[PDB]
Amino acid sequence: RLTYDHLDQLQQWTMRATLDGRTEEFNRIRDLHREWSQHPLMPVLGDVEPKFPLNLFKQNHRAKKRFLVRWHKANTPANWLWMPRGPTVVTPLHRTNPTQYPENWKQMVQ
Amino acid sequence: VSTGEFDHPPFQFRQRHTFNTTPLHDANRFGGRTAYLREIGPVNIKKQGRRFKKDPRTVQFNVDVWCAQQTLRKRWKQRDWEVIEIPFRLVPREQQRVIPELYTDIPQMTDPARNDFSNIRNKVYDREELQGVLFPAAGAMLYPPLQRVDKQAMTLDKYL
Amino acid sequence: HFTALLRENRDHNGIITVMGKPLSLVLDNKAWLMEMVLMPFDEANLDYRDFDAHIVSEGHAMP
Amino acid sequence: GHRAVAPASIDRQSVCVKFLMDELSEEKKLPVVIVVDGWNLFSHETHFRYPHPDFLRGLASFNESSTDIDLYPQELPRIPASRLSFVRGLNKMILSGDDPNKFFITCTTRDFKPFDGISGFPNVETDRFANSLDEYAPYDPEKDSHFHPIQIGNFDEYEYRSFLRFLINSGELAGLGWGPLWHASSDFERKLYKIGFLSGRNPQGVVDHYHQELVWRYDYQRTRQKQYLLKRRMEGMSRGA
Amino acid sequence: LKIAKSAFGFYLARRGQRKYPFLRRPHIKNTHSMNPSAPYFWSFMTAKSQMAFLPEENYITGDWTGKFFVSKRQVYTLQHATSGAKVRVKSFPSIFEFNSPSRWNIGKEMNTLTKPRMDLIDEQMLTKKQRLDYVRAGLLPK
Amino acid sequence: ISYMEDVGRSVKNPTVPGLMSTKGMKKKFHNLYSSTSTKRMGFSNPTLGIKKV
Amino acid sequence: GVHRVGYTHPSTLPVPCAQRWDLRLARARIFQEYIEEKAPGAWQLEDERSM
Amino acid sequence: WAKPKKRPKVGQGFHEKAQKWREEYLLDRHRALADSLRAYVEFSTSKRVEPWDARFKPFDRIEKDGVYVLMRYMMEEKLQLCNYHHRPVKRLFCNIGLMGPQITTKARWKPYRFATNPAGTSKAERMYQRDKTVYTHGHND
Amino acid sequence: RRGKPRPRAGMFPDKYRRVPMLLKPQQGGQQYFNHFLIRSTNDRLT
Amino acid sequence: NRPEVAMHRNTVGLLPAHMWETDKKTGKVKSVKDSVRDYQTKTPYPKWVQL
Amino acid sequence: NAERFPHEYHTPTSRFPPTPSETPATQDWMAYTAKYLDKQFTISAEPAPVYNVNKLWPMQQIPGKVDQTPFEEDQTWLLHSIPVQQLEMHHHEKDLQDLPFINHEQFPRSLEWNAP
Amino acid sequence: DNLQYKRYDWQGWYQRMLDVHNRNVSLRCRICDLQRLDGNGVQFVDMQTERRLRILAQHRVGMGVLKLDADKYEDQADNVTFGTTKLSELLADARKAQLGEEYWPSVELKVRKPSGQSKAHYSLIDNERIEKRSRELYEKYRDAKKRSLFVTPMETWLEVKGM
Amino acid sequence: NTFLTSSVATPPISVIRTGPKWWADPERMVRQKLMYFTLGVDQLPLRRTAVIQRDLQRFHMCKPPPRVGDSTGYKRSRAAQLNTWYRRIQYQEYHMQHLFTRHVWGLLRVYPGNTTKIQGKADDGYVGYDSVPFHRYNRAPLPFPARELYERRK
Amino acid sequence: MREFARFDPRKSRGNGQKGFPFRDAYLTKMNEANQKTPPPTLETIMDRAVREHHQHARILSPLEVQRDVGRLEPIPSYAGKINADRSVFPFQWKTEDWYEYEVAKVRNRRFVFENTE
C-alpha cells in the first residue's frame, strides 16, 4: 500500500537528494526502470495462458484457484520471455548510462 | 462534506490481508479505536467470544460515539475565543438588539442596514477594542491598540 | 436525486456549486468525476464559463 | 553551533541561536532579507504544551502523591510561538524601532486539514491531507501581524496558460509524459480548457489535475479526429484506384 | 425438540441453529456464570456498583414455613460460612450444597460458585447413539 | 483494439509449464454432478445407461 | 483545560447585570429541573447522525 | 415434527457424584483464584518492555538524542515508577506535552500482547511461554 | 446452485438489460461533427 | 485495581500471602489454609448496627 | 480506603471522563511561567476581564466546581478512561416501543401528525 | 370512536384511553401582545423583559411566540389550569427586568483570544531583566560545560524539587 | 507503512481482473503515477495500462462483435493473441509497481508488511510482530523486539 | 425565488416553517465571501473588446446565438441582461449557518399563530 504520506516523504527525500549533489540513487532507479519497462513483444498465434481443463472437478472446487496460483508461481518475472530485458536489447526510448543525463551537462558542452 | 468513514463495515466471511482488503478490526480503522472491538485470533465459537464485539447495532453505536468525539474535538480546536458576559449598556451597537436563542428563529443577520449580513451568533470581537470595557480597573491599556493598514496608502501592491 | 439550477453569466466567470460548496471540493478533486459534470457543455458545443449552476440534493443525503 | 556530538548539539544550538539573533539585531549597515514561510504559525501557539507541573516536583510512589499524571491525560495551556527563542529574536527585531536594516518578506500557509462540521475517520490508505497541520483556526494577516498584507490570487488565464504549457510540453521533452503514446491524450487546447474547469485555475489544483489527466475517461477528441483522418485516407485510396 | 428433557420438549421447536436479537434468548442458561477472572473478579457477573444493596433473596421477606434451596442469585455472606446451616441451591441433576465453607466465597453470587456445565458425564442418561457422539467429541473414553 | 504498436513477435512458448500436473488427472463426465430423472413411467432406456459393455 | 468554574456576583461588577447562571436557576425553579452536578463539561456531544 | 422421545432416567448415586464433583471443583477454584491473583498483582508490580515501536519515529532516533533526551532527564522517575505498563506510559507522554499532539497520531506503539512481556525479554516465543494454569486474561507474566 | 451445475452465461437475463441503448456505448464527441464536416468540404475543394 | 486505569498502582501489600501455601521453586500457590475456623472479627455486621 | 482505587467504586451517579484534581498555576501560560519556570516574572496572571468568562459554552455549569473542557487533542480522547457500550442499550422514551424491529404503536397516527 | 369501540364494555376504557392520550394542552401567545400598557402605565413587557423571558424559557419560544405544553394531568381541564399557572409564573419572573438594571440579562459576546500583534509582545515581556540574567546564566553554563558533556536547562534556570 | 500484518497473495491475473474496481481505480493509478514522476522516471507501462483499461471501461456494456463459423479458428486465435498481449503489458505494470514501491520504501526507512522482500535491506522476507513467533517461511525463530532494518537517527 | 424576492424578516413572526425564507438564497446572502464578486477577467475583457472594435463583430452571449439553421427567433428578454453577483447566484454558503438553518426549521414546525388579526 502506497500512501500519499509516503509520497510526501518521497518528495522531501528526492529534494534533499537533489540539493546534496547525489546522482547515485537516481542512477540505480533509472537503471531499474530501463530494465523492466521495455515494451513486451506481441505473442505468436496459438500462445495463450493455460486454463483449468473442464470436467475435472466440480465448478465450486478449490482445484481451480490452486492451479492458477501454482501456474503463476511457476512463471516468475525472471521467466517472462515475452519482455526483452538484457544487455542485448536496444532501448530506443531511453538514455543508456549516467553520462547522458542532464546532471552531467558540463561534459556535453564544447 | 467529509470524506472520512462514519460506518462500521458489516460482518461477513472473514476478511484477510490482501490487495484491496484488510481485516475488519485491523488497527488502521478509526485511528486504532477498533482495538476496543477486537477479539484476537482463531476464535472458538462454542466456548469463546465477547458477544457485543460481533453485534452490528452495538459496534455501530460505539463508532458513532467515536465520530461524535472527533467532530466535537475539531469544533473546539476551531475556537479562538471565549464567551464573556458583558452588561447591556457597554456592548457594541449591533448587539443592542434582542437575539433569540439557538435554533429558535431564522438565523439572524447582524446589521442588514449597514450592509453587514452575517450571523451574529458567529460574530467574533477583538479583545483589543473591548479593552476599556473589559479592564476598566487597569488604567493604562494592558494590550497595545491595533495597528491597521491604510487602504488608500500607496504601497507595493499598488504598483507604486 | 439532484436538481440543477442553471443561469447564464454575462461576465464570463462561471462556477458550479453543489449544496452550497464549490464543485471542486464536493466531488473531491477527482477529475474523472467532474469531467462528467463538464460533458453537457461540451456536447452542446458551449463554453462552461458562461454558465452558473448550483445543484441541490433531494435524495438520501450523505457526507 | 551545529557541529557537535549529540546530546551536546542540543544546548550548543540554544546558546548559538540566542547569540546569532543578538548579532543580527546589532548590525545596522548591512541589508538583511528575512524570508519565513507560513508566518501564521509564528503568530500563535505551537502545538506543544506546558509540562504538567508534577514532572517538576519529583515523586516517591504513584500510590499517594495525590497525582493524576499516570491516571488520566489532560491538556495544559499551549506554548505560544512567541516564547520560542528563535521567534523571540525575530519579534524583538520587528517590534523595536531603530532597526530599518531588515526587511521581512514573509508568507502564510493555509495547509491544514479540511473540516466542514462533520469529520469521519480519515481513510489512511487514501488520504491527501495526512501531512497537513491540525489547525482549523482562522487567521488574518492584518490583525495578526505587523507586516503589510499583500494578496495573491489564483492564476488568471495568461499565467495559467504559460504555466500549463510549461508542465505539459517541457514535461514531454524531458520524457516525463505521454511520449510515443501522444495520440492517446488530447491536444493542448482541449487540455487547457478542461484543466481550467477542473482546477478553477488554482496552481496546486492545476499541477494536480495535470497529473490526474492520465485517467480522463470521457474525452472523445482523438477518437473522432482519428476517425476523420482515416475516412479521408480511404477517400484518397478510392480516388487513386 | 428431539428429546424431551422437560415438559416443554413437547411444545417447542428448535428451528435449526437460529439467531436471536442481541442478548435475548428465550431460555437463559448461563454457561458462563462461573468463568474464572482474577483481575475482573469483582466486576464480572456481579453488581454493577459496589454501593448497591444485596438482592431480595438475601432476606426473609415474610413468614416462611421454610425453603428447600435458596435462589442462585443470593450472594454468599460471612454468615453463610460461620453459622453452619444448610445452604442449598437448585442445580442439575438435583441440588448443590454448600457444605465446605470458605471465606473466598464471600460477596459473590452462588450463581458464580456453581459450575453449570459439569465435566462429569453420566452415561446412564445417554442413549447409545448419544454416547457414540460424545465419543466423537473426545469427551467419553472409547 | 486499443493501443496498437509495431513491436516484434516473441518466441513460441515463452511460458514455463505450471506446478500443477494436468496429465495425471482423469476426466469425469456423466456421474460428475447429481441429477434427477424426469422419467415419468417405464423402465429407463437401457441403451443410454447400461448397454455398451 | 481543567479549570475552576466561576461566578461574579452582580454587586461586584462595575455595572450591575444579570448573570447567566442566575437565570439558569430561575428557570430551574420555574419548570422543575434536576441539575446534574456530576455532569462532565467535557462530554458535550451533539449526536452527529440525527442532528 | 416427530413426537419427542422421552428422556431416560437420571442414574444411581449420580446425585452424590455430582454434589461431590462440583464441591471439590470449587475447593480447587479457590487455589485457582488465589494463585491467579498472586500472578496478577505480581505482574502489576514488576517491570515490562518498552511499549513504543522503535521502527517508527519519534522513536527510531538515536538514544542519545531527541525523544530519548526528553525521557532521560525529565520523565525517567515517572516511567520507572509505573514499570513501563503501556497505559500509564502513554498517559505520561500525553501529559508531558513537549511532544504534545503526536503521541497518538504520528508515534506508534507495540500491539497489546507484545507490550505485555517482562523486562529483558529476548525472543518472541516468550508470548506463549507464560503460565496457562492461571486466569489473569493474558495479564500474567 | 445446490449440488447442481451453474447455468451457462446466456441462460441469464441480460446483465445490462436495464440500461438504455443510447448508453452502450456512449456516442460522445457530438461537438466535433460539424467541425469535421466543414473540414472535409474545404478539403474537397482543395 | 482493575487493569483499566490504575493497575500499576497495585501493591504486594494487598496480597494475603499468609492465607495460602506456596511452592518455593515455582513461586506458585499450591494449597489454601482454612479460612473460617480461626477467623476473628469484632465486626460481623458494620459497627453502627446493634441487633 | 476507597479513593485509593479510582476505577473500583462507582456509584450510579458517577460519570466518565473522570475530572482530574486541580493545579494552582495551570489556567494559562503567563501564570504557569510565573509560578514554575521563571519566578521573577512580573505578571502573575494574564489580564482577567472583570466580567464572567464561561469556558464551557454553551454548557452552563455549577460555579465553584472543578471542571474539564472538551478535548482538542485526539490523544486526550483516546487515552482517557471513557468506556464503550457493552450491554443492550437503553433510551428512556424509546424503551417503551421495544426494539427497532418491534416498533410498538398504540395508535395509527400519521408519522407526520402535528399536535395542535 | 365512532367505529368499533363505540358501543360495548370496552367503549369506556378505550374512550378514557384516548382522552388520557390527548391530555396535552398547548398554550400560545405572541410576544407582541405582551408589549402593551399595563394598568399602572408601565409597559407590561419591554425589551429587557423580553430578553429575560427568552432566556428564561429556552426552547419554549420560537418565531416570537411563547408556547407551553402542559401534559402533567390526565385531563384537559387540569392542564389548562397547570398551563396558566406556569405562564403567569414565568411572566412573574420575567417581569423582574423592570425593577432595575441589575436584572437585565448579560449579553454573551464571543471575545477573541488576544491577537497576533499583541501576542508578539509576549517575547519582550521583562526584557532587560531577562537579558542581564541570560549573561549570568551563560556564565553558569560555560562553567557547567567544563565538567560534563550535556548541560540541561535543569542545571541552569530550571528548578526541580528533589523530594 | 501502517499495515504491517501477514498477508494473502493473489496471482496477477486475478488482481488485474478487478478492472475499474481496484487495479484500474483511477485514484490508485494516479498516486502510482505520482510516485514514478517524483522519481524522475517516465511512466510508459502505466500509461499503456490506462490506455487499455480506459478503453475496457468505455465499452463494458456492449456485446462482443459477431463470431462467424470458422473451421480454421483464426478469429478466435487472433482475438486471443490480442488478449494475452494486453495481459502481458499489465503484468509488466503490476510487476513494475511492486518493484518500485519496495525500493522507494527502502529509501524512506519504511517497514513493509510481514514476509515481504526489500531488495537491499531484507533479502529474506522481513518480519516483526507476527501472530506466529517464528519466521513463517524461514522456519527460524524471531527476535524481540522487531528486527531493525535501518540505522537509528531520523 | 419569487418568495425570497419579497421576503422580510419582520413578517416571519407568528408563522411556522412558512416564516422561513427560501433556504439557499438566504444562506447565500448571509455569506460575505459572496459579497465580493470578481470583475470580468483581463483576457475576457480584452478579447471581447478586440472582437467588437478591431474586427467589427460583437461577441454574442449563448442566449443571443441563433441555433436553428431554419428559423430566426426572437432573442429572450433576459439574454445578456441579468448580471452576475455571487451574492445572488449561484448559491454558496458557510456550513455552520446551514446546520443552524436546518435544525431551526425542524424545531419550529409547531410555532404558529393560527388566529391572527
M19 contacts chain C (CB < 8 A): no
What Rg, from alpha-carbon coordinates, does chain N have? Answer: 21
Extract the C-alpha cell encoding C16. Answer: 458550479
**SS3 labels along chain D:** CCCCCCCCHHHHHHHHHHHHHHHHCCCCCCCEEECCCCHHHCCCEEEEECCCHHHCCCCCCCCCCCCCCCCCCCCCCEEEHHHCHHHHHHHHHHHCCCCCCEEECCCCCCCCCCCCCCCCECCCCCCCCCCCCCCCCCCCHHHHCCCCCCCCCCCCHHHHHHHHHHHHHHHHHCCCCCHHHCCCCCCHHHHHHHHHHHHCCCHHHHHHHHHHHHHCCCCCHHHHHHHHHHHHHHHHHHHHC
Extract the C-alpha cell encoding J48. Answer: 453502627
Name the minimum distance, in Å, from the CA of G17 to any CA of chain B: 5
Extract the C-alpha cell encoding D171. Answer: 514535461
Name the minimum distance, in Å, from the CA of G14 to any CA of chain B: 8
Chain D residues in contact with M26 by the CB 8 A cut-off are: 212, 215, 217
Give the HSE-up count for residue K14: Cα atoms under 13 Å, Cβ half-sphere. 17
Q: Which of C8, C16, C41, C51 to mutate to test the interface with N (most CBs of N within 10 A)?
A: C8
Cite the DSSP H helix spans in chain B. 56-76, 131-134
Cβ contact E70:J4 at 8 Å: no
Chain M residues in contact with A25 by the CB 8 A cut-off are: 107
Name the minimum distance, in Å, from the CA of M22 to any CA of chain B: 7
As a whole number of angstroms, the distance between CA L62 and CA N14 comes to 9
As a whole number of angstroms, the distance between CA L110 and CA B124 comes to 5
Q: How does DSSP assign I8-28, residue by residue? A: PGGGS--TTTTS-GGGSS---
Residue of N nearest to B121 (CA): N97
Q: Do H62 and M152 touch (CB under 8 A)?
A: yes
Cβ contact K91:L5 at 8 Å: no
Sequence letter at residue D112: F
As a whole number of angstroms, the distance between CA D143 and CA K77 comes to 33
Please work out, in degrees rounded to the nearest 5, the angle formed at the alpha carbon of residue L128 by the alpha carbons of L124 and L131.
90
Name the minimum distance, in Å, from the CA of G1 to any CA of chain D: 5
Chains L and G touch (3+ CB pairs under 8 A): yes
Cβ contact C56:N89 at 8 Å: no
Chains F and G touch (3+ CB pairs under 8 A): no
Instruction: Report how far Cα D80 is from the mean position of its chain's Cα atoms.
Output: 22
Cβ contact D131:A5 at 8 Å: yes
The CB density around residue K74, as the number of other CB atoms within 10 Å, is: 20
The CB density around residue E94, as the number of other CB atoms within 10 Å, is: 15
* Chain E partners (3+ C-beta pairs within 8 A): B, H, J, K
**Among E81, M60, D226, D19, which residue's Cα sits nearest to residue H30?**
E81
**Among A76, M85, M46, A87, which residue's Cα sits nearest to residue F7?**
M85
Q: Which residues pair with L70 in a beta bridge?
A: L25
Sequence letter at residue N12: S
Cβ contact E110:E97 at 8 Å: no
Name the minimum distance, in Å, from the CA of D224 to any CA of chain I: 7
**Among N55, N48, N54, which residue's Cα sits nearest to residue N80?**
N48
Cβ contact N16:N112 at 8 Å: yes
**Among B126, F35, I14, N103, which residue's Cα sits nearest to residue M61?**
I14
As a whole number of angstroms, the distance between CA D141 and CA D40 comes to 8
Extract the C-alpha cell encoding I36. Answer: 469535421
L108 contacts chain B (CB < 8 A): yes
As a whole number of angstroms, the distance between CA D201 and CA D207 comes to 10
Chain F residues in contact with I5 by the CB 8 A cut-off are: 33
As a whole number of angstroms, the distance between CA N80 and CA N46 comes to 18
Using DSSP, how many helices (H) and how many strands (E) does chain N show?
A: 4, 0
Helix, strand or coil, per DSSP, at residue A43:
coil
Name the minimum distance, in Å, from the CA of M60 to any CA of chain I: 8
As a whole number of angstroms, the distance between CA M124 and CA M117 comes to 6
Q: Which residues pair with B119 in a beta bridge?
A: B109
Contacts of E135 (CB under 8 A, 6+ apart): E141, E142
Cβ contact K57:K68 at 8 Å: no
Cβ contact L51:L105 at 8 Å: yes
Contacts of E41 (CB under 8 A, 6+ apart): H33, H37
Chain N residues in contact with D156 by the CB 8 A cut-off are: 41-43
Residue B70, phi then psi, degrees to nearest 5: -50, -50
Cβ contact F27:A85 at 8 Å: no
Residue of H nearest to B36 (CA): H112
User: What's the burial of H48, exposed, middle or buried (CB within 10 Å: 0-12/13-18/19+)?
Assistant: buried
Helix, strand or coil, per DSSP, at residue H48:
strand
Cβ contact K85:B52 at 8 Å: yes
Q: Which of M58, M59, M61 to mutate to test the interface with I (most CBs of I within 10 A)?
A: M61
**SS3 labels along C34-58:** HHHHHHHHHHCCCCHHHEEEEEEEC
Place of cell 438504455: I20
Helix, strand or coil, per DSSP, at residue H5:
strand
- The enclosing H or E element of M151 equals none
Cβ contact B67:B29 at 8 Å: no
The approach used to solve this structure was: cryo-EM
Chain L residues in contact with H74 by the CB 8 A cut-off are: 154
Q: Which residues pair with L68 in a beta bridge?
A: L27
Cβ contact H116:H17 at 8 Å: no
As a whole number of angstroms, the distance between CA L106 and CA L125 comes to 34
Q: Do K38 and L106 touch (CB under 8 A)?
A: no
In angstroms, the Cα distances linking H139 to E104, H112, H124, J25, K7 are 21, 10, 16, 22, 18
Interface residues on G facing L, Cβ-Cβ cutoff 8 A? 10, 15-20, 23, 26-27, 30-31
Contacts of B155 (CB under 8 A, 6+ apart): D148
Extract the C-alpha cell encoding B62. Answer: 460505539
Q: Which residues pair with L65 in a beta bridge?
A: L30, L62
Place of cell 401534559: L71
Chains J and C touch (3+ CB pairs under 8 A): no
User: What's the burial of D210, exposed, middle or buried (CB within 10 Å: 0-12/13-18/19+)?
Assistant: buried
**Among G32, B129, B128, K67, which residue's Cα sits nearest to residue L86?**
G32
**Among L55, L51, L50, which residue's Cα sits nearest to residue L36?**
L50
Q: Has D109 been labeled as part of a binding site?
A: yes
The strand pair at M116-118 and M122-126 is best described as antiparallel
* Strand ordering across the sheet containing C16-18: C2-8, C51-57, C16-18, C21-22
**Among H56, H40, H49, H50, which residue's Cα sits nearest to residue H105?**
H56
**Among B128, M8, M144, which residue's Cα sits nearest to residue H115?**
M144
Cβ contact H112:H40 at 8 Å: no
As a whole number of angstroms, the distance between CA H23 and CA E114 comes to 8
Long-range contacts at C38-43 (CB < 8 A, ≥ 24 apart): C38/D194, C38/D197, C38/D198, C39/D218, C39/I28, C42/I28, C42/I31, C43/I28, C43/I30, C43/I31
The CB density around residue G23, as the number of other CB atoms within 10 Å, is: 20
User: What's the burial of D237, exposed, middle or buried (CB within 10 Å: 0-12/13-18/19+)?
Assistant: exposed
- Strands (E) across chain H are located at 5-6
Q: Do B103 and N19 touch (CB under 8 A)?
A: no
Cβ contact K78:H104 at 8 Å: yes
As a whole number of angstroms, the distance between CA N44 and CA N51 comes to 11
CB pairs under 8 A between B and D: 67
Report which DSSP code applies to L123. Answer: S
**Among M101, M18, D129, A67, which residue's Cα sits nearest to residue B21?**
M18
Sequence letter at residue L138: Y
In angstroms, the Cα distances linking D105 to B160, D32, L118, L123 are 17, 11, 20, 21
Q: Has D37 been labeled as part of a binding site?
A: yes
Q: Helix D203-212 and helix D157-165: axis angle, to 10°?
A: 40
The CB density around residue A48, as the number of other CB atoms within 10 Å, is: 15
Chain B residues in contact with N95 by the CB 8 A cut-off are: 1
As a whole number of angstroms, the distance between CA D112 and CA B74 comes to 12
Chain N residues in contact with L66 by the CB 8 A cut-off are: none
Cβ contact E9:E87 at 8 Å: no
